[PDB]
Amino acid sequence: TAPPPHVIIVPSAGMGHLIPLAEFAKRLLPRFTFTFAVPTSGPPSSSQRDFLSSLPASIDTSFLPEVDLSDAPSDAQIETLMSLMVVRSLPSLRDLIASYSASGRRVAALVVDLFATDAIDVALELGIRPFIFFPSTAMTLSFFLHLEKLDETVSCEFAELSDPVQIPGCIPVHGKDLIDPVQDRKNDAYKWLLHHSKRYKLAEGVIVNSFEGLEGGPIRELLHPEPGKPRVYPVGPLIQAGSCEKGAAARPECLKWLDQQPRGSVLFVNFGSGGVLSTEQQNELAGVLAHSQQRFLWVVRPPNDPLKLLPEGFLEQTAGRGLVLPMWAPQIDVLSHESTGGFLTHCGWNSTLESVFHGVPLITWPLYAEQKMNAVMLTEGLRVGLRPSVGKDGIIRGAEIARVIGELMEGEEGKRIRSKMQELKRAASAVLSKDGSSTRALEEVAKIWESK
Numbered sequence: 084t085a086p087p088p089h090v091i092i093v094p095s096a097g098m099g100h101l102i103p104l105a106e107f108a109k110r111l112l113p114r115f116t117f118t119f120a121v122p123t124s125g126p127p128s129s130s131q132r133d134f135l136s137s138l139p140a141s142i143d144t145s146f147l148p149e150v151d152l153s154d155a156p157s158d159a160q161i162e163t164l165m166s167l168m169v170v171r172s173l174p175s176l177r178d179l180i181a182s183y184s185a186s187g188r189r190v191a192a193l194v195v196d197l198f199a200t201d202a203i204d205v206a207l208e209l210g211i212r213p214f215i216f217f218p219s220t221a222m223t224l225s226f227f228l229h230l231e232k233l234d235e236t237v238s239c240e241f242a243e244l245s246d247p248v249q250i251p252g253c254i255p256v257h258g259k260d261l262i263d264p265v266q267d268r269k270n271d272a273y274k275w276l277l278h279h280s281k282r283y284k285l286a287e288g289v290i291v292n293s294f295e296g297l298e299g300g301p302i303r304e305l306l307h308p309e310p311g312k313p314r315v316y317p318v319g320p321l322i323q324a325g326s327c328e329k330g331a332a333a334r335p336e337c338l339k340w341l342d343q344q345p346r347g348s349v350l351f352v353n354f355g356s357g358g359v360l361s362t363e364q365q366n367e368l369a370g371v372l373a374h375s376q377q378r379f380l381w382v383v384r385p386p387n388d389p390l391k392l393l394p395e396g397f398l399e400q401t402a403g404r405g406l407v408l409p410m411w412a413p414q415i416d417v418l419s420h421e422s423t424g425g426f427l428t429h430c431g432w433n434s435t436l437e438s439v440f441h442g443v444p445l446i447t448w449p450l451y452a453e454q455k456m457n458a459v460m461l462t463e464g465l466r467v468g469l470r471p472s473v474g475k476d477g478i479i480r481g482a483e484i485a486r487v488i489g490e491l492m493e494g495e496e497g498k499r500i501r502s503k504m505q506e507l508k509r510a511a512s513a514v515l516s517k518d519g520s521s522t523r524a525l526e527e528v529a530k531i532w533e534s535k
């Protein structure tokens with residue numbers, strides 16, 4: 084029984100980043116102890132606290148003293164605010180590390196989220212191995228590493244490009260579908276994004292939540308050893324488990340509803356927390372589901388201008404065919420149900436991976452962050468989903484919503500899309516087995532943290 088080396092994790096964004104980070108740490112237990120050094124700009128949300136306090140004991144949490152973001156623009160994008168949050172928390176992170184080291188504990192590694200590269204400077208000064216955890220696609224990681232070159236060769240706004248951007252090892256992406264922070268090169272968000280991308284080379288390794296079976300092109304290009312590019316460790320798919328072994332409780336009503344429906348016949352609609360639609364956009368979706376014969380399980384949230392904000396008599400037209408849920412739903416238990424045949428998601432990488440892991444074809448409805456690049460890679464790259472076309476007014480009309488739903492649940496492309504999605508499902512469980520490619524990646528990262 085040797086002492087467990089300690090590891091500090093520095094998350095960037097909200098719950099969407101803690102989940103994969105937590106699963107990453109949970110899979111390295113009990114070889115190491117962990118501490119979430121969580122930067123804050125205010126009282127941590129009850130969601131963050133309740134989640135982190137439910138992790139195993141070996142994964143501690145330390146909410147760093149909150150910082151003042153009032154001097155940042157009121158319209159600052161989230162990437163700008165997150166970068167300032169880490170920078171203004173480095174003294175706190177220095178003290179947190181100083182308390183563990185002062186006690187004789189070996190701090191073996193600092194794992195910084197994709198927008199916490201400024202914390203690598205602390206790890207380098209203290210002789211700690213800096214690693215970067217990328218809770219997104221290998222495609223987007225390739226975009227980060229290529230962003231420096233893409234900036235030196237393109238001068239105009241990316242949405243003004245005629246040809247798609249050619250990222251090493253990835254499929255072409257039009258400038259309008261590039262990640263949000265690059266859509267305005269005059270905004271501080273783009274300067275920060277460039278700042279971090281240039282600093283990825285400072286890490287001894289990038290841990291990306293993806294695997295080769297899911298992104299053959301980008302992964303093989305990332306694994307290509309080059310000077311000035313860090314080693315990459317594909318450890319995906321990292322997703323939470325369902326209520327299969329996470330507590331004992333009574334069956335939710337929505338799951339009982341799925342039990343009575345046929346196999347692969349229900350379309351699960353959920354844009355996730357922070358995936359709010361406009362009243363007009365929500366009406367279009369509500370109109371198609373009202374007049375469709377498709378079975379749906381829809382998680383609804385109040386628009387930005389909730390089951391009473393739905394159109395007139397919507398619940399009357401969709402009684403036993405569909406089931407509306409307010410705000411929240413057990414996403415993983417739904418996706419694992421046999422009656423779920425499709426998933427209309429915002430393409431958040433956690434939601435995407437949970438759908439790939441259970442072999443559920445997607446309706447790619449990207450919204451923000453890198454979801455549009457995830458939609459392109461899923462629908463046009465892997466051919467496991469359909470993307471409704473957005474109009475010039477930002478609204479996705481019912482004609483497109485009904486089109487993709489129809490081609491997916493019925494039709495022959497939805498027949499090929501499902502078969503292809505099953506191949507990825509079997510591949511996802513494969514890379515996570517004792518003979519898996521990702522099981523090795525974790526093992527190798529652990530050995531590096533234990534090396535010397």
Ligand SMILES: Nc1ccc(Cl)c(Cl)c1
Nearest residue numbers: 096161219223262452453
């Ligand atoms: N906010 C945000 C979260 C994740 C990613 Cl991969 C990006 Cl590009 C932005």
